[PDB]
RNA sequence: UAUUAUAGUGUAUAGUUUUUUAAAAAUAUAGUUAAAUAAAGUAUGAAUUAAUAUCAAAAUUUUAAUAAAAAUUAAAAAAUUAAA
RNA sequence: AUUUUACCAAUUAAGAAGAAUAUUAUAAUAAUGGGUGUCUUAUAUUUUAAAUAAAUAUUUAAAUUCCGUGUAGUAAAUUUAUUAU
């Protein structure tokens, strides 16, 4: 009968006569509540046995006491918020100091020296991002600092930004206040250049999504037509590398539309045309890509990028006779060829045995078992077993439902 | 079942005071009318309407 | 159910081959040319292109 | 071909750690206050429960 | 502090006094008692125990960090006699005020014989509900025969 | 406690009445009164302040 | 040994694997709807469709069966 | 010395003494002979080697597979000293001292403790700094001088704490090999100061836009003021 | 309170509080500066014995192959390891480490909390089923010298099926000029 | 009854598996080993040498 | 389990009828 | 949340709606004479038992009762399933 | 071109009031059955009897008896007294 200890936590078997017990469905163990008992705690509000006494005093202290604030304090805190301009100036100062004191990488021979970790740059980066409403990529900053030329092209831009802000210029804040028209200022241009450098570092690292986000923020900041064209071209290239063909095409079209507002010396228009053509090629519309390349050549004859893309399209056209036509409209996008696409598939791909349409199905905001999926009444669906609720037969078949 | 056919038991210590007896003709014939409470407010008056539930602070 | 076992007596199973085949196997895979997801040969998706042509 | 695996004596036999007499750590007054996890080598940049 | 008779009986500590911290984080630093929590036996002295007070963000405002002096255990601090400007033991004393001719309780410094009154408490008085507040005159009107 | 920490106001009495008997006072008859006790065993009444 | 390189197994699709070799000559018409190919799993000149084993122009004597010329493979096909 | 404090480690650990333990040792992992049950022969070089090498890798040491930390890097050693000085002396006290001898006894003792801790940390880090002189950086050397200034210790360029060697008769000092003891601490620190001054000069010579102009100006002004405070020129 | 430290061959007294705070600060900052991200998942819904097997399978692999194997496996341990790898990858991305060079430098589990469930048995007997949980430690370091196998290769069957469909066996690589700020 | 508990737990590290992990098994094995070695030394080692 | 599944299904049907 | 309708009264067309899985042994059900159902594996996870060193191929001989206790002789691989 | 054999290893410093109006004995002064969220109604809520018992006794003799189952006022209202958040 009795083999182990008398306590419920004992392992081996017991008997009703010797050690009578209550029906405890599931209770914690000697080492504290487990994930299952904690799931019961969060869902039912108490452990499944019910003999336990709920005690969430610590949770109450963490949430409700912390978020409680009287009306007067809540009203005066907004008025006593810090000074945005001074806070931004201090953030820029400390960020520049940290970047300057960041050590330079030793160029070892025979192997690649590990780039020193950026511990002290995060907090200055966090405050700078908060102040400017922008989001800087830590990977991009790491790559920029590791590269020597990019490091200088970032430090000079940051110093110019600091100088122009200290001189009393806050272009975003002034524009927002006025809106509550003019062209880009020196401070805004320096900020855009800094963000473009960060995006270039992101591209060198391989973080095309971060590069695209940084360039999008730079575009948001910019207002000059030339800056808009250049930023649109950069965003188109970043989206092409990130496997965002719709975004790349949209940015390229916007750059090509802004073409007239830009002076002849700039190449942003040609870059936008190249990006649009590349997006079309990746979407597998070779006729559209060729037409766009022809238009770009007619606009800027002799552009190196346009010539290279035209040569590549000519090679693809020479290969096409093997197929006797273009890719059929049926698929028109099926093939995937980018490392960004491969990484996305590896991350968000439906794994075998989990994260698939048979493991869990995500409803509006909730997880459901495959049987309860409202997107299909398959043979494993509960919806199949319902039928003829009482209104009408609703189906000709007479065996189930 | 009478006086209990559910889950929540009655509390006889808070039941309304008995006031009469049954009769098949009318229903419940009331005998002890004094048991029933009538909340007759005092008549209106000047100081009465000038008074307010709370007292001001000097 | 007659006597306790020692660590080596328990490790005999990992010495064996059935344990390795059941637990210590590595799957060979590749990136699908269409969806660019990890994929094992012989198994495909329910997408129309995958059904029509099976990578 | 196959992954190296070795049954763990830690799982085979895990006796409970010594308790405290009168809730007293014998060498609290002799040791530094540094985190024993840090001084043993266990560290986590992001603890998830 | 839920335990019976947890408070201090004499309770010499009142707001506006000058005290010096004798134990804890800050030792030797003196200041004025900004506030007092009697049921906890705690004191709040300006620029003594300053700690950040985070405020979770809401739909109208973001998170904001604010610093306020936190309560300090009563036993930590000791009163300072203004005349001596040093640490002096204090004791509750009773005196019949000349003006009103009635007994009252003050706190006396043993070392120097200094007397300190009890600062009266006058909470906010700007509140009021004239619609449902009985006027003082009508409230005081006596009609009981 | 949080309101005091924020507003800096002082509190002179507990915000909630505390019943240290948890109903024992209710169980005790209303007219209860401890009896007198003479010649008790305690040096507290001496008033020493040096030992 | 301080830290040996990652255990990532070299590409093995083009080597000989019996499970895949079992499908080289297996009828598969139902599998395909709109894109049928002749002996899909069969690579001419290779042992059971294993591109790592090439016998295209080595001189293996098959008097009653056909073979194909040797066109050198490519890195993106081998791995 | 393997499993315990090593070359540049700050924690002091006597491996033979079972300090920092809640249990009386019952099993000795490094055992060569059954006689060591009652005659462990600890202290003898070979048996102590066996025991210490059998000890597991603590937080100071690192396993053969875990990635170690470049503790011997000057760019890490200098900020370590700066952080030591910052912790020893609070920002408020540092500002008060810079503005200003009228100080509280607690503050004076805090400053003395900070100076003592900084001297001990310099003693512990000296071999690593000496090894890392060659591939250091001008910013990190300027940071070395700044950290010394913040700790309030005046380096012996030839208050002051490095100039006086620690007391103790030479016949009782721990001369045991394998422990990174620096008996000639003032001389070694003076040599390190001269070496870093020369390294700063060489870096400036090698170095010889608005951002870079401002950087050069601020660097020169710093170098000048810090060297003047420490009693050095050029 | 003073702490004794061996300096110049003699024991010297230093402020114990400063000594301890300095030691802990140095340990924490050294661990942070180490170019790796460590993650700890507590109360994993898997017995430590079973989870150790999947941990040993995934041990000593690059992040890419670890994720691929976990997604292609059908084990609770492998799914848990995939979740842990995703969290650790996000942490490394936030910390600034290069994704393409990530590798697993440590994967181990130890017993964690343990719930118990009553299982009725005939003849009036009963016991307590044990619901086990594990604590998973996952360290992602960076190995710049790491070289990954080329998994883009696909079977000849797939190649010729794509050729029949009209697709291109090779990817349609298009040169992408690097972003520039010349126009600004 | 006296047994070499403390004296043998010290060298308990020289055994394998269960004996090295569990105090009782290791102590029993070490006691047996010591006794057998004593007997061999006092009655056969000299003859063999 | 073979006959047990059918027995459980019949019991469930009876319980649904009696509910 | 189990074999299992608690049936008093009372009625007869309300479809009154939760039982995995790609073989085999064993086990249970199922034109001589007097062929169905229950798998491994994914997942969960008990119970009797537990002196035991990484263990006790085998034969021969013997010692105080089964004697893998002893000695001699001899030559006993690992994992998995089944078989008393 | 290709590739790193099989097997074998170990428990320790503890992060935070996750330990006190605590556990046991101890007070020779109280006492009509303690029962809070209680809250009429008293034909219906009665426990008493000369005994070893919530009252509890300072020694070895003699002595009935088939194993002797055993010792007196110490002071007379005198302080050995059933105590107590
Ligand atoms: S795209 Fe990979 S399986 Fe279909």
3-state secondary structure A181-198: CCCCCHHHHHHHHHHHHH
- E131, burial (CB in 10 Å: exposed 0-12, middle 13-18, buried 19+): exposed
CA angle D32, D37, D39 (to 5 degrees): 50
From the list I57, I68, I157, the residue facing C38 with the nearest CB is: I68
Which distant-in-sequence residues (6+ apart) come within 8 Å of A125 by Cβ?
A95, A136, A138, A141
List the chains bordering chain I where 3 or more Cβ pairs fall under 8 Å. A, C, D, G, H
Beta carbons of F5 and E38 less than 8 Å apart: no
Residue I25's nearest CA partner among H72, H10, H69, H14 is: H10
Q: Are strands B54-55 and E133-134 parallel, antiparallel or unpaired?
A: parallel
Atom 4 of ligand 1, nearest CA residue: C45
SS3 E119: coil
**Which residue's structure tokens are 């266990």?**
D42
Q: Which run of H or E residues covers position G3?
A: none
Q: Which helix (DSSP H) or strand (DSSP E) does residue A305 occupy?
A: helix A304-319
Give distance in angstroms: CA of A333 to centre of ligand 1. 13
B55 bridge partner residues: E134
Question: What secondary structure does DSSP assign to H19-44, as a single string?
Answer: -S-SS-----SS---GGGGT---TTS
What Å distances lie between residue K18 and A73, B5, K6, K12, K15, CA to CA? 62, 21, 18, 10, 5
Q: Which phi and psi angles does I128 have, rounded to 5°? A: -130, 105
Structure tokens given for I117:
């469930």
The answer to whether A146 touches A115, Cβ cutoff 8 Å, is: yes
Measured on CA atoms in the order I34, I37, I42, I47, is the torsion positive or negative?
A: negative
Write out the E strands in chain I.
2-7, 10-15, 36-44, 102-120, 125-142
Per the entry, the structure determination technique was cryo-EM
Q: Which two tokens stand for residue D42?
A: 């266990």
Beta bridge partners of E94: E105
In this structure, are residues A336 and A342 in contact, taking their beta carbons and an 8 Å threshold?
A: yes
Contacts of C53 in chain G (CB under 8 A): 32, 35
| Resolution, angstroms, 1 dp | 3.5
- Which nucleotides of strand L lie within 7 A of protein CB? 2-5, 7, 14-20, 37-38, 41-55, 78-80
Is the C-beta atom of E101 closer than 7 angstroms to strand M? Answer: no
Q: How far is the CA of A321 from the C1' of L61 (A)?
A: 94
Whole-angstrom distance, CA of residue K19 vs CA of residue K13: 10
Do the Cβ atoms of A401 and A388 come closer than 8 Å?
Answer: yes
CA–CA dist H218, H234 (Å, integer)? 15
DSSP state of B32: -
CA F41-F46-F48 angle, 5° bins: 125
Under 8 Å between Cβ of I84 and I39:
yes
Alpha carbons A298 and A302: distance in angstroms, whole number: 9
CA H108 – CA F17 distance, rounded (Å): 49
Residue pair A70/F3 in contact (Cβ under 8 Å)? The answer is yes
- Under a CB-based contact definition with an 8 Å cutoff, are residues E24 and E76 in contact? yes
Enumerate the β-bridge partners of residue E21.
Answer: E77
Q: E76, E111, E119, E117: which is closest to E94 by C-alpha?
A: E117
| Cα of A378 from ligand 1 centre, angstroms | 22
Backbone φ, ψ for residue A111 (5° rounding): -160, 175
3-state secondary structure of J8: helix
Query: Whose C1' is closest to the CA of I23: which nucleotide?
Result: M13
Residue E62 forms contact with B (CB below 8 Å): no
Distance CA H166, CA H172 (A): 13
Ligand 1 atom 1: residue of nearest CA? C35
Phi, psi of E35 (to 5 degrees): -150, 165
Question: For the purposes of burial, counting CB atoms within 10 Å of the CB of I65, is it exposed (0-12), middle (13-18) or buried (19 or more)?
Answer: buried
The angle formed by the CA atoms of residues I6, I7 and I13, to the nearest 5 degrees, is 70
Chain D environment of J17 (Cβ under 8 Å): 9
- Give the 3-state secondary structure of residue A287: helix
Q: How far apart are CA I58 and CA I71, in angstroms?
A: 12
CA–CA separation, A208 and A340 (whole Å) = 8
DSSP for E78-103, please give it. Answer: EEEETTTTEE--EEEEEEE-TTT--E
Contact I129, I118 (CB under 8 A): yes
Residue in E58, E17, E62, E59 with CA at minimum distance from that of residue E36: E17
From the number of C-beta atoms within 10 Å of its C-beta (0-12, 13-18, 19+), residue A108 rates as exposed
Task: Indicate if CB(K9) is under 7 A from strand L.
Answer: yes
* Nearest partner of A207 among I69, I90, I182, judged by Cα: I90
Structure token pair of residue A268: 């942003």
Residue with tokens 């006290």: H93
For residue I34, give the 3-state DSSP assignment.
coil
The rounded distance, in Å, linking the Cα atoms of A243 and I129 is 51
Q: Is the CB of J27 under 7 A from strand L?
A: no
Sign (positive or negative) of CA dihedral E90, E91, E94, E95: negative
CA distances from C48 to E134, G32, H164, I161 (A): 82, 12, 84, 14
Distances from the Cα of B2 to the Cα of B5, B6, B9, B10, angstroms: 7, 10, 12, 11
Nearest CA in chain H to G3: H65
- CB contact under 8 Å between F7 and A69, yes or no, is no
β-pairing, I36-44 vs D46-48, is parallel
Contact between J4 and J11 under an 8 Å Cβ cutoff? The reply is no
**Which alpha helices (H) appear in C1-55, and where do they start and end?**
7-15, 18-23, 48-52
- State how far the Cα of I25 lies from the Cα of I11, in Å rounded to an integer: 23
The CA distance from E45 to E68, in Å, is 10
Where is chain A discontinuous (C–N over 2.5 Å), named by the preceding residue? 180
Tell me the C-alpha distance between A341 and C34, whole Å: 10
Q: Helix, strand or coil for residue H67?
A: coil
Q: Which tokens sit at H161? A: 């704490």
Compute the distance from residue C41 Cα to the ligand 1 centre, in Å: 10
- Tell me the two tokens of residue A334: 């099926």
- Buried (b) or exposed (e) across H66-92, using 16+ Cβ within 10 A? bbebbbbbbbbbbbbbbbbbbebbeee
Output the CA–CA distances (angstroms, integers) from residue I125 to A12, A335, I119, in the order listed: 11, 62, 9
Specify the DSSP class assigned to residue F36. P
CA angle A5, A9, A14 (to 5 degrees): 50
**What span, in angstroms and rounded, lies between the C-alpha atoms of A334 and A318?**
22
Cβ pair I184, A193 in contact under 8 A: yes
Cβ contacts of G16-19, under 8 Å, gap ≥ 24 = G16/G47, G16/G48, G16/G50, G16/G52, G16/G53, G17/C28, G17/G50
E positions 112-131 inside 8 Å of B (CB): 125, 128-131
Which two tokens mark A242? 């990130």
Is the distance between the Cβ of F42 and the closest atom of strand M smaller than 7 Å?
no
- Both tokens of A310, joined, read 């035209």
Contact G50, G15 (CB under 8 A): yes
Mutate to test the interface with I, among A24, A139, A188, A303 (most CBs of I within 10 A): A139
The DSSP output letter for A63 is I
Residue A356 CA to residue A335 CA, distance in Å, equals: 21
Nearest to A86 by CA among A97, A94, A78: A94
Breaks in chain H at C–N > 2.5 Å: after which residues? 100, 158, 208
Q: How far apart are the first and last CA of chain G?
A: 28
Residues 41-60 of H with CB under 7 A from strand M: 56, 58
Strand M nucleotides in reach of protein CB atoms, 7 A cut-off: 3-4, 7-15, 18-19, 21, 27-31, 34-37, 39-40
A387: left (phi over 0), alpha (psi -120 to 50) or beta: left
What tokens appear for H9 in the block?
């480690």
Is I touching H (3+ C-beta pairs, cut-off 8 A)?
A: yes
Q: How many residues make up chain A in this entry? A: 401
Closest CA to D44 of A115, I18, I84: I84
Find the radius of gyration of the CA atoms of chain C. Answer: 20
Q: What angle do CA A158, A160, A166 make, to 5 degrees?
A: 100
Q: Is C52 annotated as a binding residue?
A: no
| Placement of tokens 């056969």 in the chain | J44
């Amino acid at each position: 009968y009795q083999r182990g200890g008398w306590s419920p936590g004992s392992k081996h078997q017991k008997h009703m006569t010797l050690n009578p017990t209550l029906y405890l469905y599931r209770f914690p163990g000697p080492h504290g509540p487990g994930p299952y008992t904690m799931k019961y705690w969060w869902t039912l509000g108490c452990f499944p046995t019910g003999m336990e006494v709920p005690f969430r005093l610590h949770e109450f202290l963490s949430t409700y006491q912390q978020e409680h604030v009287p009306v007067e304090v809540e009203e005066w805190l907004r008025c006593y918020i810090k000074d945005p301009l001074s806070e931004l100036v201090n953030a820029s100062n400390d960020f520049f100091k940290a970047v300057e004191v960041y050590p330079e990488v030793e160029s070892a021979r025979g192997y690649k020296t590990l780039q020193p970790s950026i511990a002290p740059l995060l907090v200055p980066m966090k405050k700078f991002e908060e102040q400017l409403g922008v989001k800087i990529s830590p990977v991009g900053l790491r790559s920029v600092l590791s590269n020597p030329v990019l490091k200088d092209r970032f430090l000079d831009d940051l110093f110019d930004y600091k100088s122009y802000v200290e001189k009393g210029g806050s272009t975003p804040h002034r524009r927002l206040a006025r809106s509550r028209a003019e062209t880009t200022a020196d401070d805004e241009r320096s900020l855009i250049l800094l963000l473009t450098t960060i995006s270039e570092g992101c591209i060198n690292a391989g973080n095309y999504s971060d590069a695209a986000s940084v360039l999008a923020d730079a575009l948001m900041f910019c207002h000059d037509p030339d800056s808009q064209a250049t930023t649109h071209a950069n965003i188109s290239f970043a989206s092409l590398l990130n496997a965002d063909f719709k975004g790349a095409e949209y940015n390229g079209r916007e750059a090509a539309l802004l073409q007239p507002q830009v002076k002849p010396t700039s190449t942003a228009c040609a870059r936008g045309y190249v990006g649009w053509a590349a997006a079309a090629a990746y979407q597998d519309d070779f006729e559209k890509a060729e037409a766009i390349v022809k238009d770009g050549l007619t606009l800027y004859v002799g552009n190196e990028h346009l010539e290279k893309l035209a040569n590549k399209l000519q090679a693809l056209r020479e290969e096409q006779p093997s197929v006797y036509k273009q890719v059929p409209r049926s698929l028109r996008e099926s093939r995937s060829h980018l490392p960004s696409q491969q990484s996305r598939g590896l991350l968000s791909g439906s794994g075998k045995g989990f994260s698939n349409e048979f493991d869990w199905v995500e409803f509006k905001n909730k997880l459901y078992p495959s049987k309860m999926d409202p997107r299909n009444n398959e043979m494993g669906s509960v919806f199949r077993r319902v039928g003829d609720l009482g209104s009408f037969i609703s189906t000709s078949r007479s065996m189930e439902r | 079942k009478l006086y209990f056919r559910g889950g929540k038991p009655p509390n006889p210590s808070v039941h309304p005071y008995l006031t009469g007896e049954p009769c098949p003709l009318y229903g419940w014939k009331v005998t002890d009318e004094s048991v029933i409470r009538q909340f007759n407010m005092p008549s209106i008056d000047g100081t009465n309407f000038r008074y307010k539930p709370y007292v001001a602070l000097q | 159910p007659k006597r306790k076992k020692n660590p080596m007596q328990l490790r005999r199973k990992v010495y064996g081959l059935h344990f390795k085949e059941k637990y210590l196997k590595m799957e060979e895979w590749y990136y699908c040319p269409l969806c660019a997801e990890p994929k094992k040969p012989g198994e495909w998706c329910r997408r129309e292109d995958c059904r029509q042509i099976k990578p | 071909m196959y992954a190296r695996f070795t049954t763990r004596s830690k799982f085979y036999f895990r006796p409970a750690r010594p308790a405290l007499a009168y809730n007293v750590d014998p060498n609290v007054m002799r040791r530094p206050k540094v985190k024993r996890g840090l001084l043993k080598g266990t560290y986590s940049d992001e603890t998830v429960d | 502090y839920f335990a019976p008779d947890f408070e201090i009986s004499p309770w010499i500590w009142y707001p506006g006094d000058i005290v010096e911290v004798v134990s804890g984080e800050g030792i030797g630093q003196r200041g004025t008692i900004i506030a007092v929590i009697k049921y906890k036996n705690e004191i709040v002295v300006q620029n003594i125990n300053v700690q950040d007070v985070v405020i979770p963000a809401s739909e109208s405002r973001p998170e904001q960090i604010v610093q306020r002096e936190h309560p300090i255990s009563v036993t930590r601090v000791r009163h300072v006699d203004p005349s001596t400007n040093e640490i002096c033991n204090i004791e509750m004393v009773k005196v019949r005020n000349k003006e009103t001719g009635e007994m009252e309780e003050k706190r006396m410094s043993l070392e120097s014989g200094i007397l300190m009154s009890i600062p009266p408490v006058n909470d906010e008085l700007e509140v009021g509900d004239p619609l449902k507040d009985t006027p003082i005159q009508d409230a005081d009107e006596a009609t009981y025969d | 406690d949080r309101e005091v920490l924020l507003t800096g106001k002082s509190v002179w009495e507990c915000p909630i009445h505390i019943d240290h008997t948890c109903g024992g006072s209710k169980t005790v008859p209303p007219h209860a009164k401890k009896p007198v006790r003479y010649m008790d065993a305690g040096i507290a009444n001496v008033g020493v302040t040096d030992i | 040994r301080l830290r040996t390189p990652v255990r990532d197994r070299k590409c093995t699709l083009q080597y000989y694997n019996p499970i895949r070799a079992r499908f080289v000559y297996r009828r598969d018409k139902p599998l395909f709807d709109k894109y049928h190919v002749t002996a899909r799993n069969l690579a001419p000149g290779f042992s059971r469709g294993a591109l790592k084993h090439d016998w295209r122009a080595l001189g293996v004597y098959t008097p009653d069966h056909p073979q194909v010329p040797y066109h050198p493979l490519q890195t993106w096909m081998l791995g | 010395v393997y499993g315990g404090s090593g070359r540049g480690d700050l924690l002091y650990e006597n491996p033979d003494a079972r300090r920092h333990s809640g249990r009386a040792l019952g099993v000795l992992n490094g055992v060569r002979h059954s006689s060591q049950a009652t005659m462990p022969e600890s202290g003898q070089l070979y048996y102590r080697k066996l025991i210490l090498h059998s000890r597991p890798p603590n937080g100071s040491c690192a396993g053969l597979q875990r990635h170690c930390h470049d503790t011997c890097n000057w760019s890490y050693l200098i900020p370590s000293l700066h952080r030591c000085a910052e912790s020893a002396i609070s920002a408020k006290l540092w500002e008060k001292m810079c503005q200003l001898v009228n100080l509280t006894q607690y503050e004076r003792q805090r400053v003395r403790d900070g100076q003592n801790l900084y001297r001990y940390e310099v003693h512990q880090r000296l071999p690593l700094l000496e090894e890392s002189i060659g591939w250091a950086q001008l910013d990190d050397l300027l940071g070395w001088f700044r950290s010394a200034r913040r700790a309030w210790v005046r380096l012996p360029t030839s208050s002051s704490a490095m100039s006086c060697r620690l007391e103790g008769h030479a016949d009782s000092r721990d001369t045991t090999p394998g422990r990174n003891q620096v008996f000639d601490t003032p001389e070694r620190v003076e040599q390190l100061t001269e070496a870093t001054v020369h390294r700063i000069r060489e870096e400036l010579q090698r170095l010889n836009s608005a951002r870079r102009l401002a950087r050069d100006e601020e660097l020169s002004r710093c170098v000048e003021e810090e060297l003047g405070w420490h009693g050095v020129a050029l | 309170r003073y702490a004794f430290v061996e300096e110049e061959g003699v024991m010297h007294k230093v402020n114990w509080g400063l000594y301890c705070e300095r030691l802990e600060t140095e340990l924490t900052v050294t661990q942070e500066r180490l170019p790796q991200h460590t993650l700890l998942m507590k109360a994993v819904p898997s017995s430590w014995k079973k989870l150790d097997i999947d941990i040993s399978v995934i041990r000593g692999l690059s992040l890419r192959e670890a994720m691929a194997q976990c997604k292609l496996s059908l084990r609770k341990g492998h799914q848990i390891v995939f979740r842990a790898l995703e969290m650790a990858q996000q942490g490394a991305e936030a910390k600034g480490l290069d994704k393409e060079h990530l590798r697993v430098a440590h994967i181990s589990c130890y017993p964690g909390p343990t719930d118990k469930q009553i299982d009725i048995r005939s003849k009036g007997y009963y016991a307590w089923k044990t619901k086990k949980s594990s604590h998973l430690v996952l360290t992602l370091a960076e190995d710049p010298e790491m070289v990954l196998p080329d998994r883009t290769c696909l079977p000849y069957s797939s190649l010729m099926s794509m050729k029949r469909a009209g697709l291109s066996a090779q990817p349609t690589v298009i040169d992408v000029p690097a972003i520039t700020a010349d126009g600004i | 009854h006296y047994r070499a508990k403390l004296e043998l737990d010290r060298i308990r590290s020289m055994l394998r598996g269960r004996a090295r992990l569990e105090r009782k098994v290791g102590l029993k094995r070490l006691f047996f080993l010591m006794r057998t070695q004593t007997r061999y030394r006092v009655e056969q080692q000299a003859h063999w040498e | 389990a073979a006959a047990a599944a059918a027995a459980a299904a019949a019991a469930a049907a009876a319980a649904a009828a009696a509910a």
